[PDB]
Amino acid sequence: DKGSVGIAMPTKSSARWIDDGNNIVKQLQEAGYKTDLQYADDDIPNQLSQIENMVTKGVKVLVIASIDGTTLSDVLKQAGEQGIKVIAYDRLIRNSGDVSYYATFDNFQVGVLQATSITDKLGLKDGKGPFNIELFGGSPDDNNAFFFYDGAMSVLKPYIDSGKLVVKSGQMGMDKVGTLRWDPATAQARMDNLLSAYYTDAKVDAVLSPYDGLSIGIISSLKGVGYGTKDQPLPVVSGQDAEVPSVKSIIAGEQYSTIFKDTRELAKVTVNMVNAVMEGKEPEVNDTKTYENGVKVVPSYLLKPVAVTKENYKQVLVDGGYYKEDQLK
């Protein structure tokens, strides 16, 4: 009876949130808490309704991975009036003074890693170039998407400036490359139209993809126009989440890279935070400057992500138990 914790996850259409949810609940119950885990099927009104009910139920702490956190201002105010502490999980909740802590991966660094996998593969440090690249971003209502993109551009921009990388479509910036709701179908269509408009004569050499779901759609589009044959190899395509279909793609020599974010580690950080709040102590945080949310800078704990390719998938994903060997066959 250490108290109840409400856990709001955005959707099951992206594999990780099932893992986040399972891992948070497993560790919280091990720590002796009761849990109320809900998934919103990416429906913003539903997620709001779910969190409202957690508040009415009288949970002591809310752990929220929001679809669009800006929609939660009113309910989080009510949570604060009731003495409920709020942990933003993975994605920062913006526009609210009632967000107490933020547990996440180093999102800027995720972007650095995605871009670096591409630049390393292209040999840009060896003076290789020029190459054509197209850019994709996440959902614009996901605060993480801006960090993934910015982190990537910290690596790519100097090469784009020098001409060694060329964005042939000229499309850059989250307002132009963002992919609403991280929808793979949308990214696939955009890739379709980039190819027809700008790559009838030229070839795509790389695509910055911020998420595995998108990477698979992008690859499908590329195969639709003849890439992925012996004569015409796929461009270098990044990713994130180490979803099984993308890992299989990487093993097959299609998708080039992904980013492994161990949800077991993020659940553990979250439990540490819950424990602290419940004991009346200050949670461990390692970043109190970065994550401005529009009202304040939320004290945060950042975990370090790991880049995965065909070269290291076994050691990173299987040896550490995230997946079993057979799942990747």
Ligand X SMILES: OC[C@H]1O[C@@H](O)[C@H](O)[C@@H](O)[C@H]1O
8 A C-beta contact, residue 191 and residue 216? no
Would you tell me how many other CB atoms lie within 10 Å of the CB of residue 224? 13
| The token pair that represents 253 in the structure block | 């020599």
Cα atoms found within 13 Å of the Cα of residue 224, Cβ hemisphere only:
15
Pairing of strands 306-309, 257-260: antiparallel
Q: Return the number of the residue (108 or 182) whose C-beta is nearest ligand X.
A: 182
90 lies in the site for ligand X, by CB under 6 A: yes
Q: Which of 7, 8, 14, 135 binds ligand X (CB under 6 A)?
A: 14
CB under 6 A: which stretch of 38-46, 78-86, 136-144, 270-278 binds ligand X?
136-144
- Per CB under 6 A, the list member of 5, 6, 16, 299 interacting with ligand X is 16
Question: Which of 60, 91, 121, 190 touches ligand X by CB under 6 A?
Answer: 91
The nearer residue to ligand X, 107 or 116, going by C-beta atoms, is 107
- Compute CA 163 distance to the chain's CA centroid, rounded to the nearest angstrom: 29
In the complex, the smallest distance separating the C-beta of residue 37 from ligand X, rounded to whole angstroms, is 17
Q: How far is residue 227 from each of residues 66, 204, 230, measured CA to CA in Å? A: 36, 9, 9
Contact yes or no for 112/158 (Cβ under 8 A): no
And the tokens for 292?
């401005």
Contact between 274 and 63 under an 8 Å Cβ cutoff? The reply is: yes
Which residues does residue 88 pair with via DSSP β-bridges, in sequence order? 64, 102
Which DSSP category does 31 fall into? T
Q: Given candidates 68, 98, 134, 241, which one binds ligand X under the rule CB under 6 A?
A: 241
Q: Provide the mask over 160-189, with x wherever binding to ligand X is found by CB under 6 A and - wherever it is not.
A: ----------------------x-------
Range in contact with ligand X (rule: CB under 6 A) among 23-31, 39-47, 138-146, 221-229: 138-146
**Shortest distance, position 278 Cβ to ligand X, whole Å:** 26
Nearest approach, Cβ of residue 139 and ligand X (Å): 7
Q: Which of residues 250-269 bind ligand X (CB under 6 A)?
A: 261
Residues of this chain that bind ligand X (CB under 6 A): 14, 16, 90-91, 138, 142, 144, 182, 211, 240-241, 261
